[PDB]
């Protein structure tokens, strides 16, 4: 119904959120790669919403530029362990949202941080507020509530993102 | 000179970059610098060289400087991480 | 590189040293603390709020709290020792043990090794086994802490006794096997792991001057492994603990201080420590522990603060949510709670103030009158649970303003501790301090410190020219000891047993020893200074009325003094020209012209200028010391040369060292 897309930074392996973001019936213990093209129903902070999954290798972060236009609702994520590979994820919203398809519909558009139980982090908002990128305002959301793998904070920007649908 | 058909690239003291390919192939020698080009750098498709006067060096195997300037000061050793042709 | 966020928890009353503990409980542990009114309590911090458990009844001031267990069971029995007896609670409000251990004054330290119980006192040390006396020791100096090596990883119980005179007497039974020497009076000590060191046994001590160590007490001798002697990190170690917070795999050292400083030391060198994270707290830390108490899954440090603020330093960020215009909501919740509480408390206390005014408070001041050794200045440190309003200093880092009139110091805003220096001369014995807190009746409490007429050490050098001096006649040894306590900074008040005691002092302004030996009716006060023995003669004659010379010693003292006066004069001579040379520096970039001589000053101009600020006090002190030395060394021969002083002053304005010694020997 209401889809959700996430991309992630390069050279991380930070894609393991969607498994613990899925329900308790089919939780996965292996690390979940952000292959994308995922098809499942998961009970989110508003209702039983849908998802989508993609891979971010620099060589590979173009299939996410092949499914970027669409999506019922939306999705925000980042790598907040990156002290060098987070300069490149700055342009990723301008790849994602700057594109005409994303801009046209007032659905869910927010970018969130990650890797909190890892030994480095930054501002909670991260994507739209820490790395000088507060200017995502006309996008009709905001993103929050991030940990690393332990499973917190998916209902953090939910009033701006999840319960905003 | 990493061409996949093995066209070697050499740098002159004068700063003029030559394109001497396999068994000393004859190719136009590009002088693509104003200052001394002592900053050659491989890029995983082409042969990256660095401009002497605080100018980023971008170029392909046919002389044409692909890149515009991107460095404030004089670089000393480039490199590149992993992606395809 | 490490970051710990300061999350505050429940506030308890004023706490003594090492009065906080963590019950071992993989989820959040439980915190247990003891107030100076006897109200030992424990909480768990389930979600934001302290879910209190068995907050007991008030009694005597809880002097120590320690958790242990009889067998290898997870240690959960929490023992306290309030006034003169040791009480014991389980991990709930059921008291099971109450050992009266009838003593005289109080307990100052205690250790529970299963059933074995090693308690301290003012001077006394006892080792009981289930309310049965088995070992009894009486040191000559006050005890700071007692520990026993792991009786399991080793075989014999070797209790260590940290004395006030910089020694660790590692005694077995009721007699010392040997004594380890450590710099500074030890205050805390605990085996540096959850077991006591991999390679057998190791003892980690922390002293009141600010110093850590790892004395490895073998069967007959210690093996020093490293020391963390500090320079800028002054402040008495009140607590230390071992816990792996960095997460590398080897346990780190969480050490507290007396100036709030909490420090983590990692062993990344695989054998030696290195500082990783330090944080000031504005009060005096009294207990430190590792683990986690809030939001299990993130290791944190629990720090007991003097006034009772049981604070934590977590490794988990605080900005969980970030959306729209925003400013989190827990801040709003805590704000509203404090709002409501302050409204209702204002109502109650206003009505009670009305009733009290129409019908018309003791507190604690943890003071510390220590003696800085690198300088010659005592560093007085007052602390109050509340904030201070003004401190009087009557006589006979600080943000306060001067109280000069007798110095009155007002403390700005909401400060608890106040550190102020006090520099007293080699003579002039005879100091009050009125402290007033910011409470409603606004009372004042007076303290009386003493500036004695010399930091005590353990050994001297007898190959120095000793200007001995002998007191004889009609003494009770206790009375002569009382005289020496009146006369010397660091000596125990209680007369040491044996009727024959020897102390090895040392002048800190310049190294001159003052060996003092005395028996029931005789006393020998050897020295390396004429000033010291002259002062001793005068003050002891004064006490009595109340109730030899080595002809080269003066030469030795003058040779000692000469470098200091030379350095002061060179200081003045360079700072005279610093600014004149700086005026030349601003032009022509100093490429070719400036002489190398003054070029050596152009760089160190800053240090020269900042030492010139303190120079005049040192110069005046040196002149006074020299004139007292001269006057006294002529006074011993029976003369009165109080008149030749101005010529000596002029000579020192010139300072021809050879002409100086000539004027000393001739007139």
UniProtKB/Swiss-Prot annotation, chain A:
The keyword DNA-binding does not apply. InterPro entries: Arl6, P-loop_NTPase, Small_GTP-bd, Small_GTPase_ARF, Small_GTPase_ARF/SAR. Pfam families: Arf. Gene3D superfamilies: P-loop containing nucleotide triphosphate hydrolases. It is found in: Cell projection, Cilium membrane; Cytoplasm, Cytoskeleton, Cilium axoneme; Cytoplasm, Cytoskeleton, Cilium basal body. GO terms for cellular component: axonemal microtubule; axoneme; ciliary membrane; cytoplasm; cytosol; membrane coat; nucleoplasm. Keywords: Cell membrane, Cell projection, Cilium biogenesis/degradation, Cytoplasm, Cytoskeleton, GTP-binding, Lipoprotein, Membrane, Myristate, Nucleotide-binding, Protein transport, Transport. One of its GO terms (molecular function) is phospholipid binding. It is a peripheral membrane protein. Involved in membrane protein trafficking at the base of the ciliary organelle. Mediates recruitment onto plasma membrane of the BBSome complex which would constitute a coat complex required for sorting of specific membrane proteins to the primary cilia. Together with the BBSome complex and LTZL1, controls SMO ciliary trafficking and contributes to the sonic hedgehog (SHH) pathway regulation. May regulate cilia assembly and disassembly and subsequent ciliary signaling events such as the Wnt signaling cascade. Isoform 2 may be required for proper retinal function and organization. Belongs to the small GTPase superfamily. Arf family. Interacts with SEC61B, ARL6IP1, ARL6IP2, ARL6IP3, ARL6IP4 ARL6IP5 and ARL6IP6. Interacts (GTP-bound form) with the BBSome a complex that contains BBS1, BBS2, BBS4, BBS5, BBS7, BBS8/TTC8, BBS9 and BBIP10. Interacts (GTP-free form) with IFT27. This is ADP-ribosylation factor-like protein 6. The lineage of its organism: Eukaryota, Metazoa, Chordata, Craniata, Vertebrata.
């Amino acid at each position: 119904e209401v889809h959700v897309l996430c991309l992630g930074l390069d050279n991380s392996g930070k894609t393991t959120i969607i498994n613990k973001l899925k329900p308790s019936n089919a939780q996965s213990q292996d690390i979940v790669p952000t292959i994308g093209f995922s098809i499942q129903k998961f009970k989110s902070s508003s209702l039983s919403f849908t998802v989508f999954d993609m891979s971010g290798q620099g060589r590979y972060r173009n299939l996410w530029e092949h499914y970027y236009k669409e999506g019922q609702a939306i999705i925000f994520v980042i790598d907040s362990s990156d002290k060098l590979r987070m300069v490149v994820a700055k342009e990723e919203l301008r790849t994602l949202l700057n594109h005409p398809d994303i801009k046209h519909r007032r659905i869910p558009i927010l970018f969130f941080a990650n890797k909190m139980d890892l030994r480095d982090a930054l501002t909670s908002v991260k994507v739209s507020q820490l790395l000088c990128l507060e200017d995502i305002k006309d996008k009709p959301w905001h993103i929050c509530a991030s940990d690393a793998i332990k499973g917190e904070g998916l209902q953090e920007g939910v009033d701006w993102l999840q319960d905003q649908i | 000179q990493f061409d996949v058909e093995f066209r070697l690239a050499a740098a002159c003291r004068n700063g003029s970059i030559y394109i001497l390919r396999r068994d000393s192939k004859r190719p136009k020698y590009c002088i693509e610098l104003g200052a001394q080009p002592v900053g050659l750098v491989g890029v995983h498709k082409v042969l990256v060289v660095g401009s002497n006067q605080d100018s980023l060096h971008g170029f392909t195997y046919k002389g044409k400087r692909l890149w515009t300037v991107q460095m404030p000061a004089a670089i000393l050793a480039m490199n590149l991480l992993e992606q395809h042709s | 590189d490490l970051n710990l966020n300061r999350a505050d928890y429940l506030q308890v009353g004023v706490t003594s040293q090492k009065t906080m503990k963590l019950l071992p409980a993989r989820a959040t542990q439980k915190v247990v603390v003891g107030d100076h009114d006897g109200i030992v309590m424990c909480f768990g911090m389930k979600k934001g709020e302290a879910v209190t458990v068995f907050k007991t009844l008030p009694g005597q001031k809880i002097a120590r709290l320690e958790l242990g267990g009889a067998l290898n069971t997870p240690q959960e029995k929490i023992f306290i020792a309030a006034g003169s007896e040791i009480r014991g609670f389980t991990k709930r409000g059921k008291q099971f043990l109450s050992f009266e251990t009838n003593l005289t004054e109080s307990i100052k330290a205690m250790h529970i090794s299963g059933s074995d119980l090693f308690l301290s006192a003012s001077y006394i040390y006892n080792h009981y086994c289930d309310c049965k006396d088995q070992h009894y020791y009486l040191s000559g100096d006050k005890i700071n802490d007692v520990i026993c090596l792991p009786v399991e990883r080793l075989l014999r119980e070797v209790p260590v006794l940290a004395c006030q005179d910089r020694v660790l007497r590692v005694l077995q039974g009721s007699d010392v096997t040997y004594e380890i020497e450590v710099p500074g009076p030890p205050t805390v000590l605990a085996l540096h792991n959850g077991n006591g060191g991999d390679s057998g046994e190791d003892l980690l001590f922390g002293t009141s001057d600010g110093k850590l160590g790892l004395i490895q007490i073998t069967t007959s001798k210690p093996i020093h492994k490293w020391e963390i002697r500090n320079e800028k990190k002054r402040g008495g170690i009140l607590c230390v603990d071992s816990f792996d917070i960095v997460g590398d795999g080897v346990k780190d050292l969480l050490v507290g201080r007396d100036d709030g400083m909490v420090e983590v030391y990692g062993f990344d060198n695989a054998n030696e420590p290195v500082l990783r994270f330090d944080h000031t707290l504005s009060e005096s830390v009294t207990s430190i522990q590792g683990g986690c108490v809030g939001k299990d899954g993130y290791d944190e440090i629990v720090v007991s603060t003097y006034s009772g603020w049981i604070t934590g330093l977590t490794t988990e960020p605080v900005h969980k949510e970030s959306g729209p215009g925003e400013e989190n909501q827990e801040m709003q919740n805590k704000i509203s709670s404090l709002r409501s509480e302050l409204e209702q408390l204002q109502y109650k206390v206003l009505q009670e103030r009305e009733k009290y005014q129409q019908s018309s408070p003791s507190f604690s001041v943890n003071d510390k009158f220590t003696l800085n050794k690198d300088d010659a200045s005592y560093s007085l440190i007052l602390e109050v649970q509340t904030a201070i309003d003004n401190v009087l200093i009557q006589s006979d880092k600080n943000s306060a303003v001067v109280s000069f009139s007798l110095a009155t110091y007002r403390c700005q805003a909401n400060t608890t501790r106040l550190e102020l220096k006090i520099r007293s001369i080699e003579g002039q014995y005879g100091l009050q301090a009125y402290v007033t807190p910011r409470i409603q009746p606004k009372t004042c409490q007076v303290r009386q410190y003493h500036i004695k007429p010399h930091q005590r050490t353990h050994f001297i050098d007898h190959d120095r020219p000793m200007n001995t001096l002998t007191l004889t006649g009609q003494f009770s040894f206790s009375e002569l000891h009382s005289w020496v306590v009146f006369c010397m900074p660091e000596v125990p008040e209680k007369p040491p047993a044996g009727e024959c005691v020897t102390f090895y002092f040392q002048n800190t302004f310049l190294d001159t020893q003052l060996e003092s030996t005395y028996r029931k009716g005789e006393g020998v006060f050897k020295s390396d200074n004429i000033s010291t023995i002259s002062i001793l003669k005068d003050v002891l004659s004064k006490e009595a009325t109340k109730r030899e010379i080595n002809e080269v010693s003066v030469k030795h003292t003058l040779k000692l003094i000469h470098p200091k006066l030379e350095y002061q004069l060179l200081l003045a001579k360079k700072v005279q020209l610093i600014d004149a040379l700086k005026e030349l520096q601003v032009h022509e970039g100093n490429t070719n012209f400036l002489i190398p001589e003054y070029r050596c000053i152009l760089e160190e101009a800053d240090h020269l200028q900042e030492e010139y600020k303190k120079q005049p006090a040192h110069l005046e002190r040196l002149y006074g010391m020299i004139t007292d030395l001269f006057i006294d060394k002529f006074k011993f021969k029976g003369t009165n040369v109080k008149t030749k002083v101005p010529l000596l002053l002029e000579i020192l304005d010139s300072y021809d060292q050879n002409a100086l010694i000539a004027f000393f020997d001739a007139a």
